[model samples]
Target: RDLLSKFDGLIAERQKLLDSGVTDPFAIVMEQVKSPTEAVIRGKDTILLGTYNYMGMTFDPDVIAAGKEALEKFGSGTNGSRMLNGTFHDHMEVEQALRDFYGTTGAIVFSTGYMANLGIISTLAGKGEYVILDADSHASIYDGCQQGNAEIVRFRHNSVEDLDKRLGRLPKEPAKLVVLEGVYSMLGDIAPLKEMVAVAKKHGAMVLVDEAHSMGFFGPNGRGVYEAQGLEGQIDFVVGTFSASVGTVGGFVVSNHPKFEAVRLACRPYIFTASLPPSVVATATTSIRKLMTAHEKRERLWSNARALHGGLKAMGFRLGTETCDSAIVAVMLEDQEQAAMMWQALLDGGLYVNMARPPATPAGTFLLRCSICAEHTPAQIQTVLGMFQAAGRAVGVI
Candidate 1:
């Protein structure tokens, strides 16, 4: 009763902010997105720094062609789950490609990234096991732990020492799972995978690293954080989505352990939900192949990231940690009202940035998130920075 009352009170307080004209913080980017050169038709022309189209392949001709070909040949949705009649040739092919890309012997594909986390976490860790997560971990990770019915413990965000301290305090003999992300979505910070993995290993725990935001853009061959930190073989499980960087919608889990194959059989999300469409599978396969060898693209992406990070820092906006080299960048704001006002002002000023508040972000802080692409021109980036400078001065951030 006490907890329920506290929850209700919290909602009521948040509702006050909503009623006071700070209602909408994040403008739905799907409705606002446009071609790089085009303006959003519904609203004023807004620069899109908010999109998760990290590789800018969402509209790439090759991806579109592959998708169109598959749609024409295979019709629309798979009408059944993989355990039923849903599994198709392209699905297996894409799974194999994912396995090869991650150097894993087994891989399972899911309909969405959220389901990937839910299915894997719930099935892998249950009533007798434990799931340790960063306090700022994504909602998918949290929900997965909940569904698993495992004991949940949260350590401070991106703090290896805090994680180590907490793990050190856990019961040493129990089966344990530690969840982390390659790139945190809201703060745009990279996890200290090497350090976190070391802590987990010291405590005899398995690690699941979600590379949804890092896949196709991080590491030498774009294999993600495990490869980036030279801990490829050390991670127990790696799960990611093909949607962000690969320009398609699908999720995957890759592991050398033979047990991963069984996850396909037991994972409720996989067993009950229909598999990805033929076009999504085909596009993911092609994109994974391209992402594997696309050094030039990766280089351009980093260059763009560095430029934007540097530009934003020079403008004196409070920023997140430096370990973040991924495409996402976050500017911190002190309060929700300022965050919403800045978001609206940025949109009104023809710049679009993601606005994260309260539950989506760490307590007491709000975020103005940006995800950069290699295709974004220098002028476009500079124009974004200029708008931030103008907005900051106008909104008292400067």
Candidate 2:
């Protein structure tokens, strides 16, 4: 076990979890995806409440058609990175679509959302520069800061006063990159972009906001939380993904800076990584264009969020936040055991939810995170509530 000794702690922890004879909650198999809001798992039709398909665009006819057409046109994968020979036609089209949707001057696509953050943050801040971020920021953001070798600083989550103070304390002369997320995925709380952006600007730090979880259903035109908060013009860079709301796979950065195009040359993630496949990009482009005018979808999504949030609160389930701030709604439990048991019961009752514990969640907090979809019919929504009530009561949570 010498080579595998490093996993001893992890092994022991997992063993403790599996000791109770519960199927491994972390190892679920989706036998078949039926729609944006449902899937087949373990030979049972399961209501998919854990998927982050915020806008329910996965089953969009236009998106699937585009993907099918691209698959017929081009073969499967592009055999090289973007800098080599992977810049396919759909790549440029999606980038242009992003520009048109966000109204930005430049856009660059990455292989995945994590890589986009890793590449952008690492490339922007070199040695001797500073990168300030929320203490509760995503792991990819932390990895990006480490990769950059920048002097990293942190402020409490959503603490505008602490951020301003930290910025003021830093060496004002050096270049600083301030990273923020439009909506935190775990707790589903929104960042105070207006105040945070103002502080970053006052301290002369360039700002980047990752809207991976907030895009496609957050703003008037589904731009993102930055646009919704009226801070679109102030934020220097916007990073997002096609997986969540766009119902595809890829990442991107949109900016209006004059030298933004230079990032394509300097970003290792963008330059060294294989670009998205033709079919994936094609579908993402079509989905994004459709989202530009998806006002009714946005409204339906918000309504679903409120309905679920209100229903769960009424059922005496403790939640991650005070209100329905976004599409994600985390139902908090007392401990890992309670959370795991409840998650399995929900799955057994024909519902699937994400069971989160530390350090993926905040320290000592365990939760069942649910991602509501716009396409969940009124009857489906009611059925999901009934399932949760049964599971919660069976597990003594209600």
Candidate 3:
């Protein structure tokens, strides 16, 4: 009666939404996944623009073959933690794949991208240390701070000056880890990492960049935005996820720090949690290796982002970024009502986009976040634009 009572307010709020007769945007179910860009939803074949499958490698033959081979050889699951009996041949291979991909000396894998952040951030900054992060960083980053005993400080999102000012206010003695992201997922904007890293370095702080949204298509060698912005050895730690471009399930941290291997021994999340299955790690290894040479795929992804962002802008729609900064293209709406209406309209029109509101977004802002995939053809982009136009008009959002 006590803990459950707290949800009464949320229950009533959600009831009002349901009474409006709009489909619940959060309760959507995928009936079938045809490819990275297409899925069957609510009995309709829908163009999937909300999925974070940037490289469109979900259906990659080589990656699938590796997974199949591992499944046949290693059976189903790891059944234990990497610290115990869970470490498999594929686990070592995936870590090696990450090292080769990022040219880092040490790579540690976590069960999911969320855990990677939780484990790394929490473990790195202890009671006496601090974790300075962007105000608009991902939920995982925030949760990481909560899980640790470190003092947490958040600067204005993507503001190098704010970061510098905040870092200047901190004590000069205690170790501080300055955390930043290569791309902001909500607004599809890239960070000025060059300036930010310089500021962090000036303050004598170690730097960590989460390249979750920028990996596989940002850098020269598909390393991330850090590499694209000419920050290789300058970065101390680089964290990423295989769920995006790798088109699988896993997270990793790569670093040249000689003591990086020690993290595997100390991190509780890595120590207590079951390691990824042999098949999943095998697929991750295959996908990461392929992504290293996937220049054409990266180009196609950028071109699709340009087409979508430009088309939406030309149609009098408000976009997150002025230009296509990344594969994500967010369309801003007025409130939750309009956002839900727009999202439902798109789904009804056989298209899918994410409806993001408060906490996940800036206060009083509701947006339909579109994530473009490399496999989306030129024709699919045109069709997607057409669908957006129809839905935006029907919902009176544009």
Q: Backbone clashes in each candidate structure, one number apiece?
A: 0, 0, 0
- The 10-residue segment of model 3 with minimum total lDDT is 357-366
RMSD of each: 3.0, 1.1, 0.9
Query: How would you order the candidates by lDDT, starting with the best?
Result: 3, 2, 1
Q: Candidate 3: where are CA atoms >4 Å away?
A: none
Off by over 4 Å in 1: 1-23, 26-43, 322-324
lDDT of 1 by residue, 43-154 (tens): 5676678777777776667777888999999988789889889888889889888987888898888899889988899999888778999998888888898888889999
Among all windows of ten consecutive residues in candidate 2, which has the lowest summed lDDT?
215-224
- Candidate 3: count of backbone clashes, pairs at least 3 residues apart or interchain: 0
**What are the Cα lDDT values of the candidates?**
0.82, 0.90, 0.92
Better of 1 and 3 by lDDT: 3
Better of 1 and 2 by TM-score: 2
Q: Candidate 1: what lDDT?
A: 0.82
Ranking of all predicted structures according to TM-score, beginning with the best and ending with the worst: 3, 2, 1
The residue-by-residue lDDT of candidate 3 on 305-388, one tens digit each, is: 999999999999998889888999999988889888888888888899998987898667789999998899999999999998
lDDT of 1 at 278: 91
Which residue pairs clash in candidate 1?
none
Q: State the local distance difference test value for candidate 3.
A: 0.92
